[PDB]
């Protein structure tokens, strides 16, 4: 079953104290009114970022796992809470498919929902909302820690009564900075035409009228390459496939130019015992140019 | 390459660049002469030893086999790159081969990425699938370090101080000492390395625990929380006005 994310996907993009200004920010964000998986444990993809929302009063879920292979002996970020302190580690502790060495990093330090934003060095944001489960009101997240790892991540997992996960998207967002300096309202710049107008006019009030806002630039469906027929091929066969050839002293030099250099037979074919060249790629020869070439044949 | 965090301290880069031991010392986006008086949020030191001929490629924007598949800097990097001859302490007679480097990979390395995975490189048409052989080269290739070779093949020790100059509470602040807090008068203030002129006055602002300084619509600093005391300040510019003769 799935649930909507009414207005979640905005954190504080910067550390400055902004006040009384409609400020524009662009970053990876989760679009407002987007779908999340209403999970009641499994493995999920990771594209650019992740959002998280946990429904629990007893701290059931305390950590996460990350990485590409997500298997033992593979570098993974491990955040864990031991009920006495919270630990952040990069130790790939042995984990099977459903978990309930070479340690490199270490760090030890119903009523509410925790919202987490991840992106890639690593970033973390969160904030808490003491509620008497998801109100549709404004949501902004405060950065927590940005601990670097310098490693590729394309997937992740969870540690272990429900939670919500949603994927952030590249977008443009605008913030109503008040006198108080916090965030009280933000409007998407790609949800609905009124919102796009609010952003382009850069205000929360639009007086009646036509307003040109942006463009409709269609994207291409595919990329086409067209050229003349492959004719004509150089006679490399004559030099290579010659039954009779001239001896090492009497070698035949064949000048070659104005030819389609089909290097495929030379290197795609594995029959030839030695294919040696220095300063030029044996596999990329089709991608290089030579004005004039000569060929010598002997035994 | 190992990454050692440098933070929660005070630094002195003047001795580091002045010393004659550093035959190579190149700074990008900052000039060393004024490193002493500007503070930084975090400094990263990455240590790795490269062959001599490939020092000049490791710079933002440049490529090369190690520059591409082994270590690469952002094209917009800020900081300094440091290198020097290391035959004396590292290279041993008879050949030093305890060092390796990755040469062939399917994809290039994006900024600050480290790869130590150990699978063969598939270069041929047919997948190797764990077979070593023709067109199946393991990516790691060792350095052949003989203490007598030419400097072009000699080992240079390298550390990259990537100065991450960020707007955040800074940690490594440089040697320059403080001066007593001044208020309600025109002064050339300098907090955490931001050079400014204006009158300090306490503000009504309340910062979020990670918040450091505010801003104005014209991208001019308008408030700062004092570094050694949580003093919210208002950087009002000193009075000025046009004068016209009659």
């Amino acid at each position, epitope marked *: 079953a799935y649930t909507n994310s009414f207005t979640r996907g905005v954190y504080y993009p910067d550390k400055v104290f902004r006040s009384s200004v409609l400020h524009s920010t662009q970053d990876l964000f989760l679009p407002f009114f987007s779908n999340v998986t209403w999970f009641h444990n499994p493995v999920l993809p990771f594209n650019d970022g992740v959002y998280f929302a946990s429904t629990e009063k007893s701290n059931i879920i305390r950590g996460w796992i990350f990485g590409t292979t997500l298997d033992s002996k593979t570098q993974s970020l491990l955040i864990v809470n031991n009920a006495t302190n919270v630990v952040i580690k990069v130790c790939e502790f042995q984990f099977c498919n459903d978990p309930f060495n070479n340690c490199t990093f270490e760090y030890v330090s119903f009523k509410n929902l925790r919202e987490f934003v991840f992106k890639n060095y690593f970033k973390i944001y969160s904030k808490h909302t003491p509620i008497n489960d998801l109100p549709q009101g404004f949501s902004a997240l405060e950065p927590l820690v940005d601990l670097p790892i310098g490693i590729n991540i394309t997937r992740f997992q969870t540690l272990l009564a429900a939670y919500y996960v949603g994927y952030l998207q590249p977008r443009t967002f605008l913030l109503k900075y008040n006198e108080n300096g916090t965030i009280t309202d933000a409007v998407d710049c790609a949800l609905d035409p009124l919102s796009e107008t609010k952003c382009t006019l850069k205000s929360f009030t639009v007086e009646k009228g036509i307003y040109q806002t942006s463009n409709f630039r269609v994207q291409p469906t595919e990329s086409i390459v067209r050229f003349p027929n492959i004719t004509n091929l150089c006679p490399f066969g004559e030099v290579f496939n010659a039954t009779r050839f001239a001896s090492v002293y009497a070698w035949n030099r064949k000048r070659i130019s104005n030819c389609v250099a089909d290097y495929s037979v030379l290197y795609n074919s594995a029959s030839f015992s030695t294919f040696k060249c220095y300063g030029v790629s044996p596999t990329k020869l089709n991608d290089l140019c030579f004005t004039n070439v000569y060929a010598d044949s002997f035994v | 390459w190992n990454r050692k965090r440098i933070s929660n301290c005070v630094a002195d880069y003047s001795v580091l660049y002045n010393s004659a031991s550093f035959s190579t010392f190149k700074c990008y986006g900052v000039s060393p002469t004024k490193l002493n008086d500007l503070c930084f949020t975090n400094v990263y030191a990455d240590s790795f030893v490269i062959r001599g001929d490939e020092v000049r490629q490791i710079a933002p924007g440049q490529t090369g086999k190690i520059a591409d598949y082994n270590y690469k800097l952002p094209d917009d990097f800020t900081g300094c790159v440091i290198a020097w001859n290391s035959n004396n302490l590292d290279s041993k007679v008879g050949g030093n081969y305890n060092y390796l480097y990755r040469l062939f990979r399917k994809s290039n390395l994006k900024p600050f990425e480290r790869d130590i995975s150990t699978e063969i490189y598939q270069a041929g048409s047919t997948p190797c699938n764990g077979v070593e052989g023709f*067109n199946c080269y*393991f990516p790691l*290739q060792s350095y052949g370090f003989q203490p007598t070779n030419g400097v072009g093949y000699q080992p240079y020790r390298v550390v990259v101080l990537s100065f991450e100059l960020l707007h955040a509470p800074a940690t490594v602040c440089g040697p320059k000492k403080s001066t007593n807090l001044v208020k309600n008068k025109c002064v050339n203030f300098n907090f955490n390395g931001l050079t400014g002129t204006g009158v300090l006055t306490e503000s009504n602002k309340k910062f979020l625990p990670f918040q450091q300084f505010g801003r104005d619509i014209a991208d001019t600093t308008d408030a700062v929380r004092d570094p050694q005391t949580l003093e919210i300040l208002d950087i009002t510019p000193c009075s000025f006005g046009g004068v016209s003769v009659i």
Partner: nanobody
Amino acid sequence: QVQLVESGGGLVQAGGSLRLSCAVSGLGAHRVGWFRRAPGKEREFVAAIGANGGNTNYLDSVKGRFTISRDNAKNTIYLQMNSLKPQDTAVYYCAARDIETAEYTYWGQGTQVTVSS
């Protein structure tokens, strides 16, 4: 250049541990490897180690039961045959790489290893 010569190949009983040791000329900067020609099959990988290296890979057939060693002192290499089951008989060879476009640039003429059940 670098030249390879092999020693220590012969007939041994099933389960026997033999010593194959191949000598090289001017080695030190090349990832040495051991290879075998099966009577009915072409050459296949056995073991490979870099200079002063721990980079070890073995085929599943040789997994857990053959290890190679590098002296770095006597200019020769050692491969550990343990309980060699009979169907692993072949002619063994050494090979190494400096800069290659084929499997490996320099090879060893090798020798014969035979096992009787």
